[PDB]
Amino acid sequence: SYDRAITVFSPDGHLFQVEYAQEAVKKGSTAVGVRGRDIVVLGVEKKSVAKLQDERTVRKICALDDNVCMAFAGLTADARIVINRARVECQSHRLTVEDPVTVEYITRYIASLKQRYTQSNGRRPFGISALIVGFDFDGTPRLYQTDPSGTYHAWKANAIGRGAKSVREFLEKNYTDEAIETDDLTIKLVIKALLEVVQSGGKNIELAVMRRDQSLKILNPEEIEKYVAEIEKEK
């Protein structure tokens, strides 16, 4: 009745197509983000190799710029478009104001794009939610989340995608100032959280870190194996 067009409000004022896009996000692979004191760690599950596929082509985590990166859960093609648009906006902002982009600026831009696609019929919402991580000029860690609706919110730590409810409950339990004390502890926290919802530990998680003034580093599979081994042993 009222779920076929984005423009039409429902009785009780629910816009339902954007809700359906938010539901589409839930289908996607899990992603998790956590703010350490000097690190921001972004972890994403890997669906499966399929044994005849090249892993390099598929990468959920991406770097918008030197100081900002994102991970997504939702439609992969839409994510690719949004990533490219945010990258060109990053370089354009540097061009315009001779300064590097702030994490809140880029998440605002991505949210504005998603909002622009929601408002008008003849265009469908981007079926993605994103986890944007970066370090600002002051050096404070920043974690933001975006959704198809176009609202953005800072999170100390969060998850998106399938099993987001379970892993975020686990993270609400586990997260504390103590865990954020160590960079290795932050990485281990996100690894344990993804382990809460994933078939196998090392094979099916792709993880990355950003340090205070370093570029994004996708942790090697051997490093992830070492960290899960340390996590597994402690239990």
Binding site: S1, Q119, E172
Partner: protein, 241 residues
């Protein structure tokens, strides 16, 4: 005996029988989904308050911005869709600065509210511009600022209609919160009394117990600019209650 045909509610630009234009009415129903916000106008100033409705502890409380600054003289409190709220806030800010640029003066609260209202009116699509949302803006705003006429509180709705109001409540518990406003309010009350009464009403309507985290509070007084009560000031007042 039930007649539920409606068959005219769908699609703006359709006058239903009795000429009611139900899409706009549904948009006005939409703000009741939003968090309750409350405004009281007094001689000493105008105060604005809202319940943040934090979903989870991990979410940063500061990020929720349901009270914002259009300019030093005017602030806004919003309930309804955060996104189209951001759009209207941007329109308000740019119009205030355009007025400063052109006339070297500060807009009145009524003029700013009219400026955003004109944008809200554009859902009708009388203009040929592509970049205007076909749906009405699913948000209600409370514009509070000190102008040449003193403290003023204006209400704005999805229709784009706007009115001055001595005290108003928007959002989910606007029904009942407005009755509490009507009984408590008297024109002579100072801003301290207004702050206390508004926080009482917000405590009544809010499901969760009131705490410094889950409310946002602000005031603009004639001498001061738009000010947000900090964690400590919020702690002091919510303790005083």
């Amino acid at each position: 005996m039930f007649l539920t045909r409606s068959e005219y509610d769908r699609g703006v630009n359709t006058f239903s029988p009795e000429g009611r234009l139900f899409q706009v009415e549904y948009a006005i129903e939409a703000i009741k989904l939003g968090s309750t916000a409350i405004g009281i106008q007094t001689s000493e100033g105008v105060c604005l308050a809202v319940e943040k409705r934090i979903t989870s502890p991990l979410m940063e409380p500061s990020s929720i911005e349901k009270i914002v600054e259009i300019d030093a003289h005017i602030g806004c409190a919003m309930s309804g869709l955060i996104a189209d709220a951001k759009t209207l806030i941007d329109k308000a800010r740019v119009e205030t600065q355009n007025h400063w640029f052109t006339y070297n003066e500060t807009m009145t609260v009524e003029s700013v509210t009219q400026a955003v209202s004109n944008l809200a009116l554009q859902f009708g699509e009388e203009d040929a511009d592509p970049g205007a949302m076909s749906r009405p803006f699913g948000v209600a705003l409370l514009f509070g600022g000190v102008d040449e006429k003193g403290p003023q509180l204006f209400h704005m709705d999805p229709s784009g209609t706007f009115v001055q109001c001595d005290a108003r409540a928007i959002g989910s518990a606007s029904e009942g919160a407005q009755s509490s406003l009507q009984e408590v309010y008297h024109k002579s009350m100072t801003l301290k009394e207004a702050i206390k009464s508004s926080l009482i009403i917000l405590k009544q309507v809010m499901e969760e117990k009131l705490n410094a985290t889950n409310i946002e509070l602000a005031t603009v007084q004639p001498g001061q600019n738009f000010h947000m009560f900090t964690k400590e000031e919020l702690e002091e007042v919510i303790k005083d209650i």
